[PDB]
């Protein structure tokens, strides 16, 4: 209907979600467990349906909305700011991912914390965090952006430190609190500089008149610093702290004692993506900045390598996922440094969806293992959590970027557009290559050690989960709702990623305008690649193949199948050679 | 046993003493107490590395625990002032240090575990 | 549902696990050892020296005991055990015993 296209209902449904969350928080005695669950489920489902309707219009067609709620605050003599929301491609790209992951995490969170005394508090905290993140990405001016920035930091401080009776979790939450205070300082100083320069806080206007101030300088006490350089420096600093780049990443692994739905939301999109959003929100500023040009690829590649290698050595499942998230944040920073804004969105969506699904599977495994998150005390879990095993296999083969999967394409697109003109290019490229191959190691380690190793766990788990009296059609080591949530999340992820791939990677370009005038020749090597580039990518392909052979055929222990393992490796090599000969030359 | 190894401002010597012996001050223990505590710590560490490990080999684990048992049976019958007993203590403290893991699995029943004290229990008052 | 009246804590028998089940499992584990001669002489009142359990085999058995009962025992608690009854009561009164 044309009325829906002219007047969005996203605002109405989001307000319904927010007000239901707040009133459930205040009137929690009237609503029991079931009442809170049902009310917030209805609100979140309506919000998701409305945003799903508008997703196609905003992404494919050139639809966007500027909504003003009213004049809000006086910030200068004779100056007032209003509460503005900008529902455009950049905002909807983050908001739809956050809302979908949040809907499925919400349904999963009731099965998780099944008999805990404070399920309602966790549900409402997750709702508050999602609302804050959605408000952050839908900002219309800088004041609303700062409000969302401070809200995501505050609500994540409560999802962390959920076990408020322990000071040990209080320390972990306070670490992130301090890092968020530093982020807020940097962002607010950058906003102050912007307002002192242009005397406006509207983002859109800022994106269209900042090029007029490229040749300007500011006078620090003994320095004359370019305006774009200092503004970009502060924005990049706060983005680095939120996105947990190297050095400022130490708060993120210590954030893992939060409940696993909170980890699924925080580490997949939302918080870790917030910094990336900033880079996408203010693209011209960083296009005109020398500091960004030098610092994004170097720090991104170092972070990618560091996170990828540290992840492959972890034994805690949540720590492995957290370090994988750090590596992927570095990869996203490099992808933004590429200069192609579509590749960033594709990487964001793929990583967020599959990382959230992997967190859900890991959370079910951890609940089965009775709060022991180290897979040194696991093994042979396939017969007790079969759905977890199979769904986890799918999610890890997609997340690790294995060949012939959806996650392969984002890595390939990243390596297509990499700029070779950097002074520190050798280090950047080596770090990127070493971080790209690390996914197979931690994916294989996690899957094999949790599900298909020897029994390393305690006898109580296995023996109590296998008594004869428990044989029934109702037998299960998880909940049906968890299985349905994971299944539907995977299906929706596949559908959305395929739709985005069609929109961006087809011969007919269909994506809406990204409001950026910096265009490079990166798509050429995607559209008309040449021979040396194909050979160069084949090199990394064969490196990954060698690593897969290593993780499959290496015997680190004595076994009755050692000799037969060597024989099978020899048979596979000979068969591959003969198969290649037959497929290439004769018939 | 309270697992406060890292949540107190301990030095390595205190942590090593707490890992090898159930106390910060092993000088107040008897000879038999010290031998039994070191044997228990060594067996616990070997189990944590060779049974609940990464690529665990049961045959190698059995060989190592048999050798350790022989050595500790020799240790028990020695005299406290002998230098050979001191060498054995040094060797097995070095073994405990060499297998030290900053990511030790802490049993959930221990006082300072990861999930300990998650709920406030109200008394009759 | 809670009766909406003041209800105090109930201590019941004070055992979080079945004492007979704990004792039988522990005695079977003890009898599994090589240096234990006969399982038929083991009793709750039996001392570790009576059944032939020297301190090294004692720590060996008590490690597998804590593995089997899904708990972990401190050095002082094990040092205070004189008979099978002491260990059985300590394990059965543990909140984490499975």
């Amino acid at each position: 209907l044309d009325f829906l296209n002219e007047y969005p209902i996203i605002l109405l449904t989001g307000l319904l979600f927010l007000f239901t969350t707040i009133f459930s928080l205040i009137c929690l005695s009237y609503l029991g467990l079931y009442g809170v669950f049902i009310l917030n489920l209805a609100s979140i489902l309506l919000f998701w349906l409305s945003m799903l309707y508008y997703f196609n219009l905003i992404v494919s067609e050139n639809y966007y909305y500027y909504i003003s709620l009213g004049k809000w605050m006086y910030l200068s003599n004779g100056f007032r700011v209003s509460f503005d929301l900008l529902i455009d491609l950049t905002s909807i790209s983050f908001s739809f991912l956050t809302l979908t992951i949040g809907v499925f995490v919400y349904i999963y969170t009731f099965s998780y914390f099944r008999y805990e005394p404070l399920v309602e508090r966790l549900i409402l905290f997750l709702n508050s965090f999602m609302i804050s993140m959605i408000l952050l990405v839908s900002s219309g001016n800088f004041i609303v952006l700062f409000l969302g920035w401070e809200l995501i930091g505050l609500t994540s401080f409560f999802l962390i430190n959920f076990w408020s009776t322990r000071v040990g979790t209080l320390k972990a939450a306070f670490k992130a609190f301090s890092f968020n205070k530093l982020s807020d300082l940097f962002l607010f100083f950058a906003i102050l500089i912007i307002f002192s320069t242009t005397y406006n806080l509207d983002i859109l206007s800022f994106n269209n008149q900042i090029y007029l101030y490229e040749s300007y300088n500011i006078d620090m006490f003994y320095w004359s610093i370019n305006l774009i350089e200092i503004i970009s420096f502060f924005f990049i600093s706060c983005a680095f702290i939120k996105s947990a780049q190297f050095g400022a990443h130490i708060w993120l692994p210590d954030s893992m004692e939060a409940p696993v739905p909170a980890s699924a939301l925080i580490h997949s999109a939302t918080l870790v993506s917030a910094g990336i959003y900033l880079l996408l929100r203010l693209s011209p500023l960083f296009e005109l900045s020398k500091y960004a040009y030098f610092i994004l690829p170097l720090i991104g590649s170092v972070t990618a390598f560091y996170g990828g290698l540290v992840s492959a050595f972890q034994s805690d499942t949540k720590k492995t996922l957290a370090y994988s998230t750090i590596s992927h944040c570095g990869f996203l920073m490099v992808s933004y440094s590429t200069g192609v804004l579509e590749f960033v969105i594709l990487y964001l969506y793929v990583h967020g969806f599959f990382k959230a699904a992997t967190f859900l599977c890991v959370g079910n495994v951890n609940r089965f293992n009775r709060n022991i998150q180290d897979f040194k005390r696991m093994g042979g879990f396939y017969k007790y959590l079969p759905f977890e095993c199979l769904a986890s296999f799918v999610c890890m083969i997609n997340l690790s970027g294995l060949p012939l999967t959806l996650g392969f394409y984002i890595k390939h697109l990243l390596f297509i557009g990499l700029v070779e003109s950097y002074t520190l290019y050798p280090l950047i490229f080596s770090s990127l290559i070493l971080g790209a191959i690390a996914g197979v190691f931690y994916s294989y380690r996690l899957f094999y050690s949790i599900f298909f190793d020897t029994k390393k766990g305690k006898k109580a788990i296995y023996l109590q989960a296998s008594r004869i009296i428990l044989n029934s059609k109702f037998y299960s080591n998880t909940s049906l709702a968890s299985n349905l949530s994971i299944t539907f999340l995977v299906l929706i992820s596949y559908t959305v990623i395929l739709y985005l791939y069609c929109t961006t990677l087809n011969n007919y370009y269909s994506l809406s305008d990204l409001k950026s005038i910096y265009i490079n020749n990166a798509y050429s090597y995607f559209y008309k690649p040449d021979y040396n580039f194909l050979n160069a990518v084949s090199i990394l392909n064969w490196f990954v193949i060698i690593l897969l052979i290593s993780v499959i055929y290496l015997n680190w222990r004595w076994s009755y199948y050692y000799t037969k393992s060597i024989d099978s490796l020899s048979k596979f090599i000979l068969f591959s050679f003969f198969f290649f000969i037959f497929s290439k030359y004769i018939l | 046993s309270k697992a406060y190894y890292f949540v107190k401002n301990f030095s390595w010597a205190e942590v090593s003493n707490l890992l090898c012996y159930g106390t910060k001050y092993p000088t107040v223990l008897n000879h038999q107490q010290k031998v039994t505590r070191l044997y228990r710590a060594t067996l616990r560490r070997v189990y944590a590395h060779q049974v609940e490990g990464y690529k665990t080999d049961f045959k190698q684990y059995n060989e190592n625990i048999t050798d350790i048992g022989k050595d500790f049976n020799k240790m028990l019958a020695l005299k406290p002032e002998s230098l050979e007993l001191q060498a054995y203590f040094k060797k097995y403290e070095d073994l405990q240090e060499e297998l030290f893991d900053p990511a030790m699995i802490i049993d959930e029943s221990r006082p300072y575990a990861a999930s300990s004290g998650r709920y406030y229990i109200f008394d009759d008052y | 549902y809670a009766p909406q009246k003041v209800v105090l804590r109930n201590e019941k028998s004070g055992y979080y696990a079945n004492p007979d089940d704990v004792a039988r499992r522990l005695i079977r584990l003890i009898s599994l050892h090589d240096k234990v001669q006969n399982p038929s002489a083991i009793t709750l009142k039996s001392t570790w020296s009576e059944i032939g359990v020297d301190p090294l085999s004692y720590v060996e058995i008590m490690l597998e005991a804590e593995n089997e009962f899904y708990i972990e025992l401190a050095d002082e608690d094990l040092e205070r055990f004189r008979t099978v009854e002491d260990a059985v009561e300590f394990i059965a009164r543990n909140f984490f015993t499975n």
């Binding site: 005394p117 | 998650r118 | 809670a2 209800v7």
Partner: peptide
């Protein structure tokens, strides 16, 4: 967790 009185 096992339920306890409030």
């Amino acid at each position: 967790f096992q339920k306890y009185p409030i």
